[PDB]
Each structure stands twice: as C-alpha cells, then as structure tokens.
C-alpha cells in the first residue's frame, strides 16, 4: 500500500510513477518521470465506472515499438498533492479512483505518503519545473 518519500528517492535511481493532482498543478511541477492522469472529472469517472476505459490502459500510449514494456514491467507508484494517511481516502478523491481502477486490473499499486508536498522536503532535485 504505502511507501515513503525516502524509499522512492532511491527506488528512482537506476518504476512507474503516476501523478493524480490537477493538470495545471502537474504542469507547474511533478516528480521527474511522473506521468499524469485525468480521472476526477465527470467524463473520466464515468467511463471508468463503466470499463469504457481504465487507468492502466490509458497510460499505455507513450511508446514507439512495444506499448506495455516498462509500463506494467515495473511496480507502480502513485501520488497526489499531500495525502498523508492514504488508508483513509474518500471515493471522490482522485487517489481513490486510480487505486480502485488499478487494483481492479489485478495490479498492486504503492501510494507515496504525503504526496508531492512531502517528497519536496529533501528531494527538490528529483522534480521538473517551469
């Protein structure tokens, strides 16, 4: 379930990272290599609560020869702005939506405790900006 900002730091240098914060926040800055996901809006939630599409499926479109290697070929990390106690996350929160959708595809995701806000205490060098 939950990982620590430190574990991710090291885990990083050599895993798929999903950012489920608001798109403009994601574009302002995200953990290097982090991939963004639109899920909270009506259309997204809907089509998700209908199998029309699924998170893992979505992010499987950034390749050139094979669209899955490096994708489900690594553990999946997931993070939001700051959720400290992931265990308790409302069904509306983007964090909830992703986790349910990935878990629904037989995938065990790992949530970064304290989201991006935490990870920036001593990891600013592991982030993209503007």
């Amino acid at each position: 379930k939950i990982i620590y900002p430190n574990d991710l730091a090291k885990k990083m240098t050599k895993p798929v990272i999903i950012d489920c914060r608001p798109f403009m926040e994601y574009n302002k800055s995200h953990i290097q290599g982090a991939v963004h996901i639109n899920c909270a809006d009506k259309i997204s939630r809907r089509r998700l609560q209908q199998g029309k599409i699924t998170v893992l499926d979505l992010i499987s479109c950034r390749e050139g020869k094979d669209s899955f290697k490096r994708i489900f070929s690594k553990e999946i990390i997931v993070y939001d702005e700051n959720t400290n106690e992931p265990s308790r996350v409302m069904p509306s929160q983007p964090l909830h939506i992703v986790l349910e959708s990935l878990k629904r595809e037989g995938k065990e995701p790992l949530v970064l405790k304290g989201g991006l806000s935490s990870f920036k205490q001593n990891h600013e060098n592991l982030c993209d900006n503007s």
Partner: protein
C-alpha cells in the same frame, strides 16, 4: 418566491435570493455586471450576471430575449448552462432587471495557454471536449461563430465549457470578408486554430486587419485551386486572391514539428479552405486522435431549437414580456 437581500457593489445595486451569498464583483462591460458568489443551496461557487438596461431599445430587448432563450436551451456538460434566472420585480411592469446564474468557471483557455505548456493528453482532452459540445450545439442547428480561447472556460479538473455565442484570429475565411455562404463547419476552422495554439503556444494566424489575415491563412493552406477558387463569393475577395502570388500548400508535418502525427492529420482536416471539405464535429470526434475518449453513446445531441421568433419584428413591450415569460417558465436543473 425566495427572500432577496439588497446590497451595493461598485456603484451598482445587487438584489439577489438568500441562497446566493458572498457576492464578489468580478467585473462588467456592455453586457452587464457579474459577481462571483457561493450558492448555499448547491455548494457551487457561482457567477451571477446582472443584466441592466436589457430593454432600453428594440435591438436590446430582442438581444436580451435571444440570449435567455438560447441559454435555457443548452443542457450539456461542455456548454454554458443556466443554473438559475431571476428578477426581484413582481409585476411585468416593475420588470426591467434580469439576473443570470451559472457555475463560476475559473480560468479560460487563454489564461491556461499563457501560463503553462500542456501535455498532448491535455490538448487532446481539451479539444475532445470542445468538439463534444460543438456536436451538441450544431445538433440544435446553431452556429457559434465566435469560438476562441477566451470563450472556452476550464476548471481545475480540466473540464471545459463553451461560452456565449482578436476574434478575427480564429474566424474562418468564409465568414471572414463577410460572405453569405457560411455554415456550422465554420466553427471547426476555429477549433483547428485553437488546437494549433494548444500544440505550440503560438497564435497561428495573428493577422493585422484581416487583409493579411487572409494572406497569413493562404500562406499556410496555399492559394486556391482551379475549381476551389470557383467555389467562393464576393467580388473583392475573388480578385484579391488572384491578385496574390500563388503560394503552395505547406506540409503541416513541417509546421508542427515534433507534434503528435494524428494531431497534424486532424488539423489537416480542419484547416481546409473549402468549407465543404472541412470535417464535421461528429466526424472529428471519431478521428484516431480521440481514440481513448471516443464514446458514441456518451456524445449527446440537442433537440431542435426554435429560431422562429428571430424572424418576427416586435416592440419593446412585446419582447420585454416575452422575456418575462421565459424568466417565469424556468425549470431549475436537479
């Protein structure tokens, strides 16, 4: 009838139902004044537009009538919708103030583009949405005619709405010089211009005074063909093009370097000079660029729209009452 509470914001006096609270002057203009609020009876930050002097003229009375009818009609996630419309007036005689309520939509495509650089998925999601409501709007046999970034509202969840139907930079060539041969496809030219901006952060046809506007356009799509030229209107318009040095169509693949191939193909289909060759909203929805998002069952259409009133010519008294009628026959959404 609810309970209103008067108050004065920036020299105009606002009289609104108890449920709307924390009115904050966001601005004004010709159209009227608008306050940002909070609707306790819904939890939504909302926008209240105070329409004053809606009947100080026939042109105005009708205009006020039109906007209201049109607004009451649209019911689509990607189109501006009326959450409420009210009047403190109790009698058609004490009537001369109209207030329109809608979700306060923060930001606009203009602000977004000038602030940050979006990912291809963002561009794709944003444009998918424009097309979705454009399909809806066209269903009701309505042309937007003034589609531009500043008319596109986007919230934090990247949801977008089209609002009230520089402007020259997105106007389509046909309706450019003023020819009576335009149609719904005229909005697709705009979406193409917009998509191009999303993809490059640069205005595609920033023309000075629309002469060059046409030059800039031609400079990209190329000077008309042999029959294509014989597919147009105007006297002047016709001559100018021939009066110009024949330019060849550019290959968008070189203009939009490093851009998603399916994108430039779509643009290739929208930024077409022959409006009869220009792709439709419905058709664009199906293009491979929207694969992950295309769901025919999730792309509604409107019901016909009675533009009949448009023809008739009436007097302030008529239009005014006709408006009170709409104001009263209003059924809130749920």
């Amino acid at each position: 009838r609810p309970t209103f509470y008067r108050q004065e914001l920036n020299k105009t006096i606002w009289e609104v139902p108890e449920r709307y609270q924390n009115l904050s002057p966001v601005g004004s203009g010709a159209y009227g004044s608008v306050c940002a609020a909070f609707d306790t009876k819904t939890g939504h930050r909302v926008a209240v537009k105070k329409l004053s002097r809606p009947f100080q003229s026939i042109i105005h009375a009708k205009r006020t009538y039109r906007e209201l009818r049109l607004l009451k009609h649209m019911k689509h996630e990607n189109v501006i919708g009326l959450l409420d419309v009210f009047t403190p007036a109790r009698s058609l005689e004490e009537f001369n103030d109209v207030y329109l309520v809608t979700h306060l939509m923060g930001a606009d495509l203009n602000n977004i583009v000038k602030c940050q650089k979006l990912t291809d998925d963002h561009v794709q999601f944003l444009i998918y949405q424009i097309l979705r409501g454009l399909k809806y709007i066209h269903s009701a046999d309505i042309i937007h005619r003034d589609l531009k970034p500043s008319n596109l509202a986007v919230n934090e969840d990247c949801e977008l709405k089209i609002l009230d139907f520089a402007t020259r930079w997105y106007r389509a060539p046909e309706i450019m010089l003023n020819w009576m041969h335009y149609n719904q496809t005229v909005d697709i030219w705009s979406v193409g211009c917009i998509m191009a901006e999303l993809l490059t952060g640069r205005t595609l046809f920033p023309g000075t005074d629309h002469i060059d506007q046409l030059k800039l356009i031609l400079r990209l799509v190329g000077t008309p063909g042999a029959e294509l030229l014989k597919k147009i209107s105007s006297e002047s318009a016709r001559n100018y093009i021939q009066s110009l040095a024949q330019m060849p169509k550019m290959n968008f693949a070189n203009v939009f370097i490093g851009a998603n191939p399916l994108a430039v193909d779509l643009l290739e289909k929208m930024l077409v000079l022959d409006s009869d060759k220009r792709i439709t909203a419905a058709q664009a929805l199906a293009h491979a660029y929207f694969a992950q998002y295309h769901d025919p069952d999730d792309e509604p259409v409107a019901d016909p729209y009675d533009q009949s009133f448009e023809s008739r010519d009436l007097l302030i008294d008529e239009w005014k009452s006709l408006t009170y009628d709409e104001v009263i026959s209003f059924v809130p959404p749920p």
